[PDB]
Amino acid sequence: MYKVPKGLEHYQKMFQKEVTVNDLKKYLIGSDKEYRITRRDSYMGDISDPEVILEYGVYPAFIKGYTQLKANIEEALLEMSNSGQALDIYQAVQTLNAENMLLNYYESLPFYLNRQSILANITKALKDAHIREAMAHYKLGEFAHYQDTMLDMVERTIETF
Amino acid sequence: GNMERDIFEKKFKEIKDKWVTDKQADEFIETADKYADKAVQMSAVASRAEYYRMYVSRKYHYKKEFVEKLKQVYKESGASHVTSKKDVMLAFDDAKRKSTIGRQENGLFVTSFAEDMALLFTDQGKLKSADQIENIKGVDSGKYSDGVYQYEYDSELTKNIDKLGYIRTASGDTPGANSLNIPGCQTWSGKHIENSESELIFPSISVKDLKSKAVLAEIDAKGYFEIIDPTIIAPNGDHKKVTGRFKIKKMQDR
């Protein structure tokens, strides 16, 4: 069962307060370094890690009573998935994925996202030729060091939903 | 002051990750010259000044003979990467990782198996506590509360990987490097520089078609899970079957 981690208290405190939908988007993306939430072993280091955000930020704050985080994260995710911006859709896909990875490990989580509309939006994003092309070509930051494209990472992740 | 340490500190501040505490940041700066000197003594870098210059350039380079000397250690004992059960699961389950242990063609950070054997066990051959090992490795408290897991390339695998020319040294822009990575083929281990171990990058292991649930059950039952003649990912992305043994272990008393 999920349990609040001991570490990274600064991340825990970040979410124990009023957090807007716009702020959650900035955190989930992490293109702005001031909002970049990672850990030592995060797969990439130059964009946020949505698994860290759920595990260390959102779930601990939810548990302390900041229940508005669930609806607000869902709206942040809806917005990101409809943004038409490669990195943001990628980060949306990675947050739904993060829930699944945390479910696999912890076997039970504080809550489960309402994700039907987010899933739909993602499907519709990936039907758009210009979005697929941006994702196929996305080679900024650490993506430049992988043969595996953003697009294919996204596609293989969607298949696991 | 000294210009080399001024640029060092400036560069660190520019790249510092959001998970780094003020205390770690302060220790990283304060201890910098001890790590520079360690690298000089190991013939890893030309001089303490050169250590700082290479850190700022982000381009870590080393002399052939030094890297050959260091590889000898790994060839003798094999290679080790300690990790959590959660991270082992992610290698199999997380689709962006493409069923590889390590960052696809970008590889896996390792130390020598001998070094982890020396550092993680007491003189009575007892595994140190999770708390002690989390401290040694500078990870978050509770990282190993579910077990100290370990990837092991054996000597034979290591030798054949070297014969292919697939061993790498880290650089400033290596995927998986962060703001606490340093030059000198060595780890930054905080104020306790006695915990610092050598550092190389090994080719990733393909776990295509393996299931995390079953692998973790085999580990629970026998203490390890082994791949004979694993498929490795070359730096250029080639998949190549290499003779030797790779293990995923839950570390335990001798």
XYZ file of C-alpha atoms in Angstrom:
415
model
C 0.000 0.000 0.000
C 1.165 3.522 -0.719
C 2.842 5.235 2.150
C 4.190 8.760 2.498
C 7.951 8.684 1.897
C 10.353 9.966 4.510
C 12.484 11.999 2.215
C 12.493 15.160 0.203
C 10.438 17.135 2.644
C 10.858 20.268 0.614
C 8.892 18.661 -2.148
C 6.229 17.544 0.299
C 5.739 21.075 1.602
C 5.458 22.549 -1.863
C 2.031 21.039 -2.345
C 0.643 21.572 1.127
C -0.909 24.877 0.267
C -3.144 26.435 -2.337
C -1.811 25.268 -5.713
C -3.471 26.525 -8.894
C -4.146 24.510 -12.039
C -1.612 26.770 -13.813
C 1.008 26.036 -11.164
C 0.395 22.289 -11.409
C 0.953 22.493 -15.174
C 4.255 24.312 -14.642
C 5.313 21.590 -12.175
C 4.205 18.653 -14.309
C 6.110 20.014 -17.310
C 9.176 21.459 -15.565
C 10.503 23.359 -18.582
C 10.919 26.292 -16.149
C 13.768 25.261 -13.832
C 12.010 26.863 -10.825
C 9.229 24.293 -11.249
C 11.368 21.284 -12.180
C 10.652 18.387 -9.809
C 13.084 15.489 -10.206
C 15.008 13.054 -8.075
C 18.566 11.727 -8.263
C 17.511 8.698 -10.336
C 14.899 10.413 -12.570
C 15.136 8.962 -16.107
C 15.672 12.424 -17.490
C 17.025 15.349 -15.463
C 16.032 18.391 -17.466
C 12.208 18.133 -17.296
C 9.955 17.224 -14.371
C 9.320 13.706 -13.289
C 5.507 13.209 -12.772
C 6.129 10.101 -10.633
C 8.075 12.226 -8.119
C 5.311 14.839 -8.207
C 2.605 12.232 -7.333
C 4.670 10.204 -4.869
C 6.311 13.094 -2.965
C 3.975 15.981 -3.660
C 0.377 15.268 -4.588
C -0.313 12.111 -2.518
C 1.204 13.450 0.754
C -0.765 16.715 0.408
C -3.973 14.869 -0.455
C -3.475 12.788 2.681
C -3.070 15.997 4.780
C -6.453 17.144 3.452
C -5.630 19.088 0.284
C -8.183 17.057 -1.681
C -8.662 19.794 -4.331
C -5.371 18.492 -5.828
C -7.225 15.587 -7.523
C -9.690 17.758 -9.546
C -6.974 20.316 -10.158
C -4.404 17.791 -11.437
C -7.106 16.355 -13.693
C -7.740 19.804 -15.179
C -3.973 20.471 -15.515
C -3.703 17.159 -17.395
C -6.718 17.881 -19.582
C -5.090 21.203 -20.549
C -1.692 19.669 -21.202
C -3.114 16.889 -23.366
C -4.980 19.547 -25.451
C -2.017 21.969 -25.646
C -0.785 20.799 -29.077
C 2.751 21.082 -27.614
C 4.896 17.947 -27.796
C 6.576 18.149 -24.388
C 3.354 18.968 -22.570
C 1.411 16.043 -24.147
C 4.428 13.834 -23.361
C 4.318 14.944 -19.722
C 0.551 14.280 -19.595
C 1.158 10.748 -20.886
C 3.968 10.355 -18.357
C 1.652 11.390 -15.461
C -0.990 8.794 -16.334
C 1.896 6.362 -16.705
C 3.316 7.436 -13.337
C -0.032 6.552 -11.682
C 0.204 3.060 -13.243
C 3.828 2.592 -12.182
C 2.981 3.719 -8.648
C -0.044 1.388 -8.639
C 2.186 -1.525 -9.793
C 4.661 -0.895 -6.998
C 2.456 0.197 -4.133
C -0.595 -1.924 -4.953
C -3.057 0.696 -3.668
C -2.993 4.541 -3.976
C -4.827 7.340 -2.092
C -6.970 8.068 -5.120
C -7.252 7.212 -8.837
C -7.438 9.898 -11.508
C -10.615 10.466 -13.501
C -8.830 9.938 -16.775
C -11.455 9.134 -19.418
C -11.378 12.615 -20.996
C -7.558 12.895 -20.674
C -7.236 9.531 -22.444
C -9.572 10.746 -25.141
C -7.668 13.945 -25.631
C -4.445 12.156 -25.929
C -5.900 9.863 -28.633
C -7.135 12.922 -30.523
C -3.735 14.713 -30.165
C -1.935 11.735 -31.698
C -4.260 11.743 -34.714
C -3.139 15.270 -35.548
C -0.351 15.156 -38.175
C 1.410 18.288 -36.863
C 1.521 17.007 -33.279
C 2.836 13.584 -34.359
C 5.480 15.341 -36.469
C 6.569 17.586 -33.573
C 6.858 14.522 -31.357
C 8.743 12.481 -33.984
C 11.223 15.343 -34.302
C 11.492 16.400 -30.678
C 15.196 16.409 -29.931
C 15.653 19.184 -27.394
C 17.524 18.526 -24.165
C 18.163 14.902 -23.251
C 15.949 13.631 -26.053
C 18.867 14.474 -28.327
C 20.726 11.530 -26.759
C 18.135 8.871 -27.631
C 17.491 7.032 -30.877
C 14.087 6.198 -29.399
C 11.797 9.109 -30.348
C 9.437 11.030 -28.137
C 6.680 9.813 -30.514
C 7.540 6.153 -30.052
C 7.921 6.530 -26.270
C 4.472 8.088 -26.252
C 2.945 5.389 -28.482
C 4.355 2.484 -26.482
C 3.208 4.159 -23.232
C -0.363 4.640 -24.570
C -0.526 0.920 -25.391
C 0.092 0.206 -21.695
C -2.993 2.212 -20.597
C 40.266 33.175 -4.070
C 41.027 31.171 -7.204
C 39.368 31.494 -10.533
C 39.026 27.784 -11.118
C 36.955 27.275 -8.005
C 34.958 30.391 -8.779
C 33.920 29.069 -12.109
C 33.340 25.612 -10.618
C 30.959 27.058 -8.025
C 29.213 29.291 -10.572
C 28.620 26.327 -12.883
C 27.314 24.132 -10.042
C 24.844 26.836 -9.006
C 23.631 27.135 -12.618
C 22.932 23.388 -12.930
C 21.951 22.472 -9.338
C 18.925 20.102 -9.305
C 15.783 20.961 -7.291
C 16.240 17.858 -5.113
C 19.642 19.004 -3.840
C 19.376 20.390 -0.291
C 21.178 23.560 0.787
C 23.334 21.313 3.005
C 24.341 19.012 0.121
C 25.041 22.053 -2.052
C 27.251 23.531 0.645
C 29.122 20.195 1.128
C 29.545 19.826 -2.646
C 31.288 23.227 -2.808
C 33.288 22.887 0.410
C 34.603 19.406 -0.384
C 35.352 20.136 -4.069
C 39.132 20.330 -3.686
C 39.422 17.014 -1.845
C 37.736 15.303 -4.821
C 40.055 17.210 -7.157
C 43.060 16.011 -5.232
C 41.753 12.400 -5.149
C 41.486 12.528 -8.939
C 45.090 13.757 -9.232
C 46.405 10.992 -6.974
C 44.576 8.400 -9.099
C 46.209 9.850 -12.287
C 42.615 10.459 -13.398
C 43.198 14.160 -14.141
C 46.251 16.289 -14.979
C 46.023 18.559 -11.921
C 43.527 19.918 -9.354
C 43.133 22.963 -11.562
C 42.405 20.759 -14.590
C 39.668 18.968 -12.623
C 37.877 22.294 -12.127
C 38.415 23.324 -15.771
C 37.035 20.037 -17.094
C 34.031 20.286 -14.732
C 33.176 23.712 -16.199
C 33.748 22.604 -19.808
C 31.346 19.709 -19.183
C 33.659 17.639 -21.387
C 35.425 15.014 -19.286
C 38.469 13.446 -20.913
C 40.988 11.002 -19.598
C 44.257 9.441 -20.715
C 44.066 5.957 -22.275
C 46.396 4.350 -19.734
C 44.337 5.616 -16.839
C 41.099 4.267 -18.220
C 42.819 0.942 -19.070
C 44.097 0.721 -15.472
C 40.630 1.439 -14.125
C 38.937 -1.095 -16.453
C 41.337 -3.734 -15.085
C 39.598 -3.488 -11.668
C 36.206 -4.052 -13.293
C 37.479 -6.902 -15.430
C 38.810 -8.558 -12.264
C 35.711 -8.315 -10.059
C 32.846 -7.381 -12.396
C 30.577 -4.309 -12.143
C 27.895 -3.290 -9.697
C 24.917 -0.826 -9.713
C 22.917 -0.708 -6.470
C 19.265 0.347 -6.811
C 15.710 0.022 -5.332
C 13.062 -2.639 -6.010
C 10.920 0.165 -7.513
C 13.633 1.022 -10.050
C 14.099 -2.631 -10.981
C 10.319 -2.788 -11.673
C 10.497 0.356 -13.819
C 13.042 -1.249 -16.158
C 10.518 -3.874 -17.168
C 7.255 -1.936 -16.816
C 7.918 1.643 -17.856
C 7.487 1.808 -21.653
C 9.865 4.743 -22.342
C 12.700 2.676 -20.893
C 12.136 0.177 -23.796
C 12.715 -2.940 -21.649
C 16.300 -2.049 -20.850
C 18.219 -1.840 -17.587
C 20.199 1.395 -18.024
C 19.252 4.362 -20.244
C 19.016 2.485 -23.537
C 22.207 3.172 -25.644
C 23.394 5.699 -23.031
C 24.234 2.845 -20.605
C 24.232 2.296 -16.870
C 26.463 4.004 -14.275
C 28.500 1.321 -12.453
C 31.228 0.860 -9.890
C 33.475 -2.203 -9.523
C 31.874 -5.240 -7.852
C 34.906 -5.341 -5.468
C 34.298 -1.759 -4.355
C 30.618 -2.347 -3.477
C 31.634 -5.606 -1.734
C 34.167 -3.705 0.411
C 31.876 -0.780 1.168
C 28.456 -2.346 1.805
C 29.371 -5.211 4.168
C 30.710 -5.317 7.722
C 33.813 -7.319 8.659
C 31.540 -10.187 9.754
C 30.180 -10.369 6.180
C 26.868 -8.797 7.213
C 25.092 -6.483 4.792
C 25.062 -2.992 6.317
C 21.590 -1.685 7.287
C 19.379 -0.032 4.661
C 19.847 3.210 6.623
C 23.646 2.917 6.518
C 23.696 2.093 2.791
C 21.248 4.898 1.907
C 23.719 7.225 3.669
C 26.718 5.779 1.876
C 25.016 6.053 -1.531
C 23.505 9.542 -0.799
C 19.960 8.610 -1.651
C 16.653 9.500 -0.027
C 15.819 7.908 3.298
C 13.859 4.689 2.703
C 15.179 4.145 -0.811
C 16.298 0.617 0.154
C 13.684 -0.105 2.855
C 12.252 -2.792 0.497
C 15.776 -4.196 -0.043
C 19.124 -3.165 -1.481
C 18.952 -4.414 -5.047
C 21.975 -4.832 -7.232
C 22.792 -5.224 -10.917
C 25.934 -7.284 -11.437
C 27.904 -7.817 -14.620
C 30.250 -10.748 -14.001
C 33.947 -10.756 -14.949
C 33.409 -12.705 -18.188
C 30.590 -10.403 -19.362
C 32.728 -7.411 -18.403
C 35.753 -8.742 -20.281
C 33.725 -9.347 -23.467
C 32.087 -5.930 -23.184
C 35.581 -4.400 -23.019
C 36.743 -6.462 -26.054
C 33.886 -4.843 -28.021
C 35.121 -1.416 -26.907
C 31.754 -0.644 -25.250
C 32.929 0.723 -21.875
C 32.533 4.500 -21.449
C 33.489 7.237 -19.016
C 30.839 9.741 -17.950
C 30.853 13.331 -19.129
C 28.957 16.451 -18.071
C 26.175 15.848 -20.561
C 25.782 12.098 -20.104
C 22.128 11.096 -19.676
C 21.667 10.260 -16.016
C 24.403 12.572 -14.833
C 23.102 15.252 -12.450
C 24.461 18.260 -10.531
C 26.226 15.998 -8.004
C 28.230 14.170 -10.684
C 31.934 15.061 -10.836
C 35.007 14.394 -13.053
C 37.657 11.760 -12.265
C 35.760 8.503 -12.906
C 34.679 8.711 -9.263
C 31.484 9.263 -7.233
C 30.779 12.240 -5.003
C 29.951 10.790 -1.628
C 29.526 13.948 0.453
C 31.772 14.867 3.360
C 32.637 11.182 3.777
C 34.996 10.942 0.795
C 36.035 7.546 2.182
C 32.719 6.325 0.653
C 33.711 7.534 -2.865
C 33.989 4.739 -5.418
C 35.111 4.551 -9.015
C 32.617 5.305 -11.751
C 32.207 3.989 -15.299
C 29.334 3.646 -17.781
C 28.486 0.096 -18.910
C 26.219 -0.894 -21.805
C 22.570 -1.451 -20.887
C 20.994 -4.866 -20.654
C 17.947 -5.790 -22.680
C 15.101 -7.345 -20.692
C 12.768 -7.632 -23.702
C 9.914 -10.077 -22.974
C 10.828 -10.490 -19.279
C 8.135 -9.717 -16.725
C 8.895 -7.794 -13.522
C 6.467 -9.877 -11.407
C 8.260 -13.148 -12.331
C 11.796 -11.757 -12.076
C 11.075 -10.325 -8.613
C 9.563 -13.649 -7.477
C 12.722 -15.527 -8.573
C 14.773 -13.000 -6.601
C 12.548 -13.516 -3.516
C 12.984 -17.299 -3.785
C 16.655 -17.627 -4.659
C 18.230 -14.228 -3.846
C 18.904 -13.415 -7.510
C 17.750 -13.665 -11.093
C 20.274 -14.346 -13.815
C 20.551 -13.850 -17.531
C 23.068 -16.111 -19.236
C 24.632 -14.559 -22.353
C 22.573 -11.365 -22.151
C 21.727 -9.039 -24.994
C 23.432 -5.702 -24.404
C 22.805 -2.331 -26.000
C 25.923 -0.873 -27.640
C 26.675 2.871 -27.505
C 25.551 3.065 -31.174
C 22.324 1.232 -30.401
C 23.321 -2.206 -31.726
C 21.822 -5.090 -29.748
C 24.448 -7.750 -29.269
C 24.369 -11.070 -27.399
C 27.519 -11.244 -25.180
C 28.889 -14.277 -23.356
C 28.854 -14.007 -19.560
C 26.354 -13.557 -16.764
C 24.250 -10.600 -15.650
C 22.434 -10.790 -12.318
C 19.679 -8.849 -10.605
C 20.163 -9.492 -6.895
C 18.587 -8.607 -3.604
C 21.788 -8.150 -1.560
C 22.046 -10.244 1.571
C 24.483 -11.415 4.261
C 27.339 -13.550 2.820
